[PDB]
């Protein structure tokens, strides 16, 4: 969990010091910024089944070839797993807004993803067509607040920068 | 290691849930007294060089066979290590008070301390009293009822952080028992 | 079956079984040869009895399969026929048990709670079983069609 | 045939009686606190 | 069967003292959330069938407890579930209004895990169903109200475990 | 090819971290590289010095009061004319490395300490040690370490820029090389003064013998037992803090284990293991009752497709369409989320959770029956009539010795 | 009338309470007293009990 | 580690014998079908990156709780880790088929995999299901009865090497159980 | 520890203030010399951290074959277990000194110790040396004739408590012989 606490108690623990004033000041930022980034953790949680539904079909509207036989989305079970994975990436973004950093993404979704998407022959460009559709469907003062749309998008295209 | 934010993440992963409106009231109340927690860690780390000599020397005046020859605080190198693990434990408890969860206590301080103290031949019951004087001091500093140094504070209730730091020292005193 | 509830009837009454009860357990077991033949006909006709069963069901209730219907798409329509395979199976149990006791505690008790809680129109599934009944009785003689159809309409009655 | 079978009788039953032993509401067999400890032989001072 | 006011009065009475500033301090805290709990219990009463339909379809609808051999196969057994899930969503509504989970273990929790083991009901699938039911309940009543209603769901899940 | 190249080949041109270190336990915890920058602040020189003292001394109390031979070897490094490889060579030639890990150590304990300190790993096979035994006895200790860090191992996996660390390298060339790794680098607490027992044999904690365990595992092919690789263990320190449904962390060993509790637990884990082997042959085809009609309900439902939004007007009402990839198959949000709820609701997974949960309860209950003669028992159960007999007179199992005195 | 005592059919079908318990709870129910208690006199309620 | 020639040498060095003509009838027959062994192990290595994804995901379709949160093949680290030991085992079996002797499998791949997989919480019955799918594929590619790919081969029998690679896969099943 | 002197229960709702049906006459009679006994156990357990380390190193430096390799105290697990068992034995004499009778010692500590030490190869001739040092150590501490440490007791006599605790140590020492 790469967060604002676990950088100031991982660098102090490697240094062997008590949490000084440089590390109590860093968690004062975890009180001002977290008023906004939990609002984007709450709107994304209460509307998650409609976001992935509006986002996961843009994977197949853009790439219509996936329903061909032999390809990745060829039958019923493989289409449901493709909508499952965008629900996973929308869940870790809800986990990353409530942690405070990119902790649940760099450990649980990103690390090892370039080795499973090459082995199982999944196109990783099809994943970022679904996430970048979600970044551009974001109306900034309608979906959430102005600041919570900054926090929600900055974990979204970080996940795009991880997959590409 | 985890904190109080990511303890309810891996609890909400065990349920394959989003962190919705039920769990965020547990965390928005956690940042509501976020100024209270940093006022509680600052009472610990400002006296932390004096609390470790207050607590190791309280163990000596109770069990004086440690400084007896053949003991475990007799050799002067062996005394200087016992002042070190009084404050490495206080370094990892103060991280656990800062993070709000005792994972870094469980996974770094107590990760093998029990078979360490057997294999060094350290008396374990005196390691309880080295820990538990720091429990009775930190609940005196956080409640600001230390009998010779009062710190300035905005007034109000603080007894949840007192029992939280008393819960982290037991987690130490039970793992090395 | 007729054997188990003719017992539990006389069980509750603190008595043994009368001639009226024992001349029918007797009459039922001699009927057992003819029952297995009837259930044997429906056993390996489930491909036609179900698929033609859902044939008339969609022609009579296009709403349930149209967009917005409960059984819409490739997915629900497969489960749309799955339930008919269930109820066709329970009728084979009732024919061999000589009673709707197998159909009673499976697929009938509290069936309205399930289908109301699934969003399925319970009247629609009743229409499906009626379409299966005409296919089933068309596969048997008149003496048999008075039985195989006889268990369907009981399922029709309890399903509304 | 499924491993986690169940309880009950009549049709829709897995061949296992109700409650795994025909008792729906089982009378308990434990003792109270202090003589569950008295039988253990380890909580003697307690 | 005590609410927040009953529990406050009991603890203040059990020492034989009057309602001091600390006892009334929590009572004022309960009256502040009195407006939130009724609206939370309002919408849950309206969408009772919809919430249970959403939870089972989201947690255990297509798993093999639903298929033959699974713990939920026959229609009597399926119908017992939504009857059974109705109590969890209903009694949790009572705890949300009373502000005290005493009614749950009084009327739900005691003899519950000992009963499911008798019937052979899977406690593992039961708790997610309640976890999924807790997830949809936070959708309706909002965040903080979901935090309140959610605080009694996991109380059921904890004791039922 | 999931992993293209190991960590023993150097990282080629196009990565900042090697491919095995991305998805191993490298990224989770504090066993990472803290490679020195080019020019650096004396605070950042103290950061790379404090990691060297943690690594090559193995959490030993270095007693900063003295640092006697250290501050010449520090000041060669703080200038920059000593490499981090040449600092960690020079620390392994001093007296305060000799009086800790050489003056009391067996030559098995010394070689297994140089593998943990200088390299990352454990010793893999037997003749890997037998090189370093014969290199010490013919060339001496100063020419041992010089012939130990200048092979092909150290210059690829750390270079001359980074400090050593515990090498969670993913591909382990015996499988026990992960087991002896985590048994040597024993958690975040234990040092090698503790692990070799140099304090308890010491005369007032000084000049004691650094004896060794695991000498029976380097001679014969024998794995490490699992309690030393799961309890006092660096995997607890670089723990993912998951929800792992078989929890890998071992329970503490219970007081008052009974044979009546084990003898039903072994029958329970044989009951689930015989029921798992039956249910796994029927999986994924006959357990799916909706699978048999997918060939027909998929072609019955391919009639009157709607290309824009709006049709299926159905007698003149709206009743429109969704036209996505999901809802053209009729699926919902409760149709891809049904995979996440497949622990309670599954049947094959229902067995394999409680198989590994009760075997893990068995492997700490059976291993707590290593205590026999003065152990005070108790009867926590209600002393029921179920009792296995003590019929152990004649041969019942008798493992096949066809060569009884074959000569 | 589609009436339902799901809690009582619960606690009797499992055997958690007797038929006598299920009968007594039916008597103290409100669907009972609306049926055979409210429209009658305490005199007539005793005989109908 | 050994091979098929040097297995009979340490068998003959236990009685200090020369390698005579009565022993060498197996080894002269070993190079007589030495074309077939390279023709066999080419078919596994040319399909090895799809053999693992056929098998680890074939374990998933039999036990679908592993992809649920909690099951040991859920996170993208864990799936890339489970695919990684899917091809470590397939590498060493193809090493063992090539040398014709199971020594390189049992001192380098399987020596201590059982105690490793206990420590990580990897379920040991599911790894037999990953191995037995790779057991049924390696006997399919060698006998060229794979139902969606045929490769070109000279005409003749091959079922001895199908039996030998079958016995190198049940050593993996017996090591970790 | 706390069963060694019976207490009185004065409040209601107890079942022992009213329907006690007894007062414990064997243990009231031991508060008739109770302060002198409680100073004697306090004389032992304030030096119990030093008495066990002196006595175990006493038999090491008189019989030096135990710390030789091949001996029964060379390795670290055996050296930690030997310091543990003298500490456990010194606790159980301090139960029996406190309770005033040896009936706690013979079943919880001595019942099945001679069969244990021959089942582990523990030298029984050397372990009786280790308790005779602690027999000689405890009579110095109770009579306050220790050379390097005195304690400020009251003015009185403590023989026939020193010979009471010396009668427990050979009762240990013949139960393992
Ligand atoms: C090595 C060959 C060797 C020893 C080591 C040493 C051990 C030893 N000591 C005694 C006698 C006593 N030991 C005592 C213990 C202590 N004295 C203290 O003040 C501190 C608190 C504590 C040690 C940490 C005491 C009180 C005595 C009694 C004598 C006295 O009044 O000091 C013995 C036994 C001697 C005997 O039985 O007569 C041994 C073996 N002595 C060594 O020779
Ligand atoms: C969807 C728009 C894609 C697509 C997806 C598929 N993914 C398949 C399997 C799969 N996906 C993941 C990653 C995912 N699972 C997780 O648990 C997490 C987060 C922790 C993520 C991101 C894994 C690990 C796996 C393998 C195991 C499994 O879930 O089955 C998959 C099945 C592959 C197959 O059966 O061959 C598909 C079809 N593929 C598409 O069609 C579009 C491009
Ligand atoms: C003092 C309160 C104790 C006591 C302590 C001794 N510890 C000695 C060495 C030592 N101490 C620790 C504890 C600490 N260091 C860590 O790194 C961590 C966790 C991250 C902790 C909690 C360790 C690990 C070690 C071993 C280190 C080493 O020596 O290499 C020690 C000296 C032994 C010696 O020098 O031989 C002492 C005396 N002993 C006591 O009696 C009180 C109770
Ligand atoms: C309980 C342990 C104490 C106590 C705590 C209270 N602290 C309160 C306010 C407070 N403390 C700080 C400083 C703290 N925040 C930081 O960001 C840093 C370092 C970077 C520190 C040390 C602040 C900023 C505040 C907020 C008010 C202010 O502007 O100073 C407080 C008031 C309520 C609240 O704000 O939560 C309490 C009750 N007070 C006590 O009586 C015990 C001893
Ligand atoms: C996959 C089909 C399994 C499964 C596997 C997991 N293995 C994990 C780590 C791991 N795997 C191995 C085996 C392999 N690596 C080797 O180096 C050698 C021989 C030299 C072999 C046979 C090892 C040694 C390790 C530990 C290495 C490491 O993790 O750094 C693993 C990750 C657990 C974690 O990250 O904590 C998984 C998930 N899991 C499954 O469910 C199927 C059955
Ligand atoms: C058994 C698994 C197969 C099969 C095997 C046969 N292979 C036969 C001959 C053969 N294969 C090769 C190529 C091989 N030798 C090499 O040196 C290399 C790589 C550098 C490879 C891939 C050669 C050279 C030959 C010899 C004849 C030729 O020159 O082509 C063969 C014929 C008998 C024999 O020569 O051993 C058989 C039966 N054929 C099968 O039917 C299954 C599927
Ligand atoms: C040191 C003064 C001795 C010596 C001691 C060893 N004892 C070993 C094991 C052991 N000791 C006991 C008895 C102890 N445990 C109790 O629970 C009680 C009373 C309540 C007593 C007195 C037991 C039951 C055991 C076995 C179980 C255990 O390990 O605790 C031991 C280990 C033997 C070995 O590992 O080989 C040692 C070395 N042995 C000596 O040589 C000196 C004289
Ligand atoms: C938690 C994150 C979260 C979001 C980011 C949004 C994302 C979002 N918006 C819409 C849906 C919509 N979004 C918009 C807004 C706009 N349309 C535009 O083209 C403009 C850029 C912008 C004006 C501000 C409008 C007008 C609709 C309704 C019609 C439509 O789909 O475009 C939908 C489809 C479901 C629905 O109708 O709500 C989704 C998922 N909702 C969420 O819950
Ligand atoms: C025989 C030797 C012996 C001692 C040295 C003292 C040591 C001592 N002090 C405290 C108890 C305490 N100890 C301290 C410590 C300190 N006070 C400060 O202001 C400084 C920060 C630090 C000294 C540098 C504090 C703050 C308390 C809590 C109460 C208070 O003093 O205000 C306790 C725990 C309570 C108790 O057991 O009594 C002990 C053992 N007592 C002894 O019996
Ligand atoms: C739940 C999902 C699921 C799967 C993924 C497969 C997995 C799978 N494949 C095979 C059986 C096999 N699996 C393969 C593997 C492959 N075929 C190729 O040509 C490629 C190289 C590679 C896919 C990339 C081969 C070659 C066989 C032997 C038969 C054949 O396909 O010709 C078997 C054993 C026999 C069987 O049950 O069919 C299993 C379980 N089956 C499933 O039920
Ligand atoms: C043996 C007695 C018995 C029955 C009958 C039974 C029914 C049953 N029907 C289901 C679903 C379903 N059933 C239908 C049915 C229909 N749609 C229509 O339009 C038609 C009117 C109707 C069929 C003729 C649909 C669409 C679903 C899926 C609903 C959803 O996905 O939300 C499900 C949930 C998925 C499953 O586990 O199969 C069950 C358990 N179970 C039983 O044990
Ligand atoms: C108010 C507190 C309270 C509770 C909770 C309660 C539960 C309860 N659940 C029951 C059965 C049941 N409960 C279930 C439930 C499930 N099957 C699954 O797979 C799921 C995991 C789960 C749904 C979430 C089923 C299938 C039965 C029928 C068992 C049978 O016929 O053997 C029964 C037996 C009698 C009956 O239902 O009439 C009782 C008494 N009683 C109470 O008084």
From Swiss-Prot, chains B, H, I:
One of its GO terms (biological process) is photosynthesis. Transmembrane segments: none annotated. (2R,3E)-phycoerythrobilin 2 binds at residue 158. It is found in: Plastid, Chloroplast thylakoid membrane. It is a peripheral membrane protein. One of its GO terms (cellular component) is chloroplast thylakoid membrane. The keyword Membrane applies. (2R,3E)-phycoerythrobilin 1 binds at residue 82. Contains two covalently linked phycoerythrobilin chromophores and one covalently linked phycourobilin chromophore. The modification N4-methylasparagine is found at residue 72. The keyword Coiled coil does not apply. InterPro entries: Globin-like_sf (IPR009050), Phycobilisome_asu/bsu (IPR012128), Phycobilisome_asu/bsu_sf (IPR038719). Keywords: Antenna complex, Bile pigment, Chloroplast, Chromophore, Electron transport, Membrane, Methylation, Photosynthesis, Phycobilisome, Plastid, Thylakoid, Transport. Phycourobilin binds at residues 50, 61. Light-harvesting photosynthetic bile pigment-protein from the phycobiliprotein complex. Belongs to the phycobiliprotein family. Heteromer of 6 alpha, 6 beta and one gamma chain. This is B-phycoerythrin beta chain. It comes from Porphyridium purpureum. The gene is cpeB.
């Amino acid at each position: 969990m790469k967060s604002v606490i676990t950088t100031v108690v991982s660098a102090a623990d490697a240094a062997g010091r008590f949490p000084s004033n440089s590390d109590l000041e860093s968690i004062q930022g975890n009180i001002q910024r977290s008023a906004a980034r939990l609002e984007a953790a709450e709107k994304l949680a209460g509307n998650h089944e409609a976001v992935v539904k509006e986002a996961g079909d843009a994977c197949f509207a853009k790439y219509a070839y996936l329903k061909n036989p032999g390809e990745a989305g060829e039958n019923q079970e493989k289409i449901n797993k493709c909508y499952r994975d965008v629900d996973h990436y929308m869940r870790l973004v809800n986990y990353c807004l409530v942690v405070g950093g990119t902790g649940p993404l760099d450990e649980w979704g990103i690390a090892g993803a370039r080795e499973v998407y090459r082995t199982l022959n999944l196109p990783t460009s099809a994943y970022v067509a679904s996430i970048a559709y979600t970044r551009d469907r974001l109306c900034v003062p309608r979906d959430m607040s102005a600041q919570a749309g900054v926090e929600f998008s900055a974990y979204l295209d970080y996940l795009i920068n991880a997959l590409s | 290691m985890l904190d109080a934010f990511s303890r309810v993440v891996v609890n909400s992963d065990a349920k394959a849930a989003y962190v919705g409106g039920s769990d965020l009231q547990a965390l928005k109340s956690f940042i509501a007294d976020g100024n209270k927690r940093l006022d509680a860690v600052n009472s610990i780390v400002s006296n932390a060089s004096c609390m470790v000599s207050d607590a190791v020397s309280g163990m000596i005046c109770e069990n004086p066979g440690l400084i007896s020859p053949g003991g475990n605080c007799y050799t002067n190198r062996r005394m200087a290590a016992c002042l070190r693990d009084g404050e490495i434990i206080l370094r990892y408890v103060s991280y656990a008070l800062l993070a709000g969860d005792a994972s870094v206590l469980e996974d770094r301080c107590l990760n093998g301390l029990k078979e360490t103290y057997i294999a060094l031949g350290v008396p374990t019951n005196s390691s309880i009293r080295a820990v538990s004087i720091m429990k009775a001091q930190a609940v005196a500093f956080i409640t600001n009822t230390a009998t010779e140094r009062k710190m300035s504070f905005a007034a109000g209730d603080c007894t949840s952080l007192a029992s939280e730091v008393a819960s982290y020292f037991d987690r130490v005193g039970a793992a090395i028992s | 079956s007729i054997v188990t509830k003719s017992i539990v009837n006389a069980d509750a009454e603190a008595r043994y079984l009368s001639p009226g009860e024992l001349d029918r357990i007797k009459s039922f077991v001699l009927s057992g040869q003819r029952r297995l033949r009837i259930a044997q006909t429906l056993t390996e006709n489930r491909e036609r009895i179900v698929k033609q069963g859902g044939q008339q069901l969609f022609q009579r209730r296009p709403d349930v399969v149209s967009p917005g219907g409960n059984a819409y798409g490739e997915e629900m329509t497969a489960t749309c026929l799955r339930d008919l395979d269930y109820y066709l199976r329970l009728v084979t149990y009732g024919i061999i048990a000589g009673d709707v006791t197998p159909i009673e505690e499976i697929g009938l008790v509290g069936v309205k709670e399930m289908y109301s809680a699934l969003g399925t129109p319970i009247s629609g599934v009743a229409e499906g079983i009626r379409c299966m009944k005409d296919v089933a009785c068309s596969l048997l003689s008149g003496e048999d069609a008075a039985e195989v159809g006889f268990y369907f309409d009981y399922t029709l009655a309890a399903m509304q | 045939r499924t491993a986690y079978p169940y309880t009950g009788s009549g049709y829709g039953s897995a061949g296992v009686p109700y409650g795994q032993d025909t008792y729906g509401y089982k009378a308990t067999t434990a003792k109270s606190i202090t003589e569950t400890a008295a039988q253990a032989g380890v909580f003697n001072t307690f | 069967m005590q609410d927040a006011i009953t529990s406050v009065i009991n603890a203040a009475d059990v020492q034989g003292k009057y309602l001091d500033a600390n006892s009334v301090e929590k009572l004022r805290g309960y009256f502040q959330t009195g407006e939130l709990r009724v609206r939370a219990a309002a919408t849950i009463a309206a969408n009772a069938a919809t919430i249970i339909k959403e939870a089972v379809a989201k947690s255990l609808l297509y798993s093999d407890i639903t298929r033959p051999g699974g713990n939920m196969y026959t229609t009597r057994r399926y119908a017992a579930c939504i009857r059974d899930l109705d109590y969890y969503l209903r009694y949790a509504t009572y705890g949300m209004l009373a502000g005290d989970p005493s009614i749950l273990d009084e009327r739900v929790l005691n003899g519950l895990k000992e009963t499911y083991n008798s019937l052979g009901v899977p406690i593992g699938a039961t708790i997610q169903a309640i976890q999924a039911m807790k997830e949809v309940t936070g959708s309706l009543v909002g965040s903080d109200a979901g935090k309140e209603m959610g605080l009694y769901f996991d109380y059921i899940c904890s004791g039922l475990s | 090819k999931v992993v293209d190249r190991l960590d023993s080949q150097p990282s080629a041109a196009f990565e900042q971290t090697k491919q095995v270190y991305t998805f191993s336990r490298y990224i989770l915890g504090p066993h990472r590289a803290v490679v020195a920058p080019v020019a650096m602040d004396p605070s950042e020189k103290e950061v790379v010095l404090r990691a060297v003292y943690r690594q090559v001394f193995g959490n030993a109390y270095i007693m900063e009061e003295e640092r006697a031979e250290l501050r010449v070897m520090e000041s060669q490094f703080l200038l920059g004319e000593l490499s981090v490889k040449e600092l960690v060579r020079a620390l392994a030639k001093s007296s305060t490395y000799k009086v800790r890990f050489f003056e009391g150590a067996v030559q098995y304990r010394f070689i297994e300490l140089c593998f943990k300190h200088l390299l990352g790993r454990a010793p893999d096979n037997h003749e890997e040690i037998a090189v370093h035994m014969r290199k010490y006895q013919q060339e001496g200790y100063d020419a041992e370490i010089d012939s130990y860090l200048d092979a092909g191992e150290y210059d690829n996996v750390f270079g001359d820029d980074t400090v050593p660390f515990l090498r969670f390298r993913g591909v382990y060339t015996p499988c026990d090389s992960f087991n002896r790794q985590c048994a040597l680098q024993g958690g975040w607490a234990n040092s090698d003064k503790a692990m070799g027992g140099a304090a308890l044999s010491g005369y007032n904690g000084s000049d004691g013998r650094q004896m060794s365990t695991m000498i029976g595992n380097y001679i014969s092919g024998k794995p490490i037992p699992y309690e030393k690789v799961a309890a006092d263990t660096p995997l607890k320190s670089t723990a993912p803090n998951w929800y792992a449904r078989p929890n890998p962390a071992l329970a503490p060993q219970p007081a008052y284990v009974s044979a009546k509790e084990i003898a039903e637990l072994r029958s329970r884990v044989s009951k689930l293991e015989a029921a798992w082997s039956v249910a796994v042959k029927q999986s994924a085809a006959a357990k799916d009752t909706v699978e048999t009609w997918r060939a027909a309900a998929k072609e019955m439902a391919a009639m009157r497709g709607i290309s824009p939004m709006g049709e299926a007007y159905f007698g003149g009402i709206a009743q429109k369409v969704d036209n996505g990839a999901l809802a053209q198959l009729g699926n919902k949000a409760s149709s891809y989320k049904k995979y996440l709820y497949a622990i309670e609701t599954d049947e094959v997974s229902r067995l394999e959770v409680d198989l590994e949960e009760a075997k893990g309860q068995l492997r700490v209950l059976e291993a707590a029956m290593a205590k026999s003669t003065p152990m005070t028992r108790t009867a926590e159960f209600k002393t029921l009539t179920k009792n296995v007999a003590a019929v152990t007179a004649a041969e019942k199992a008798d493992p096949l010795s066809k060569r009884p005195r074959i000569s | 009338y589609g009436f339902s005592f799901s809690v009582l059919e619960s606690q009797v079908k499992n055997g958690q309470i007797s038929i006598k318990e299920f009968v007594r709870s039916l008597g103290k129910s409100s669907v009972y007293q609306k049926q055979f208690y409210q429209p009658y006199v305490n005199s007539r309620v005793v005989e109908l009990a």
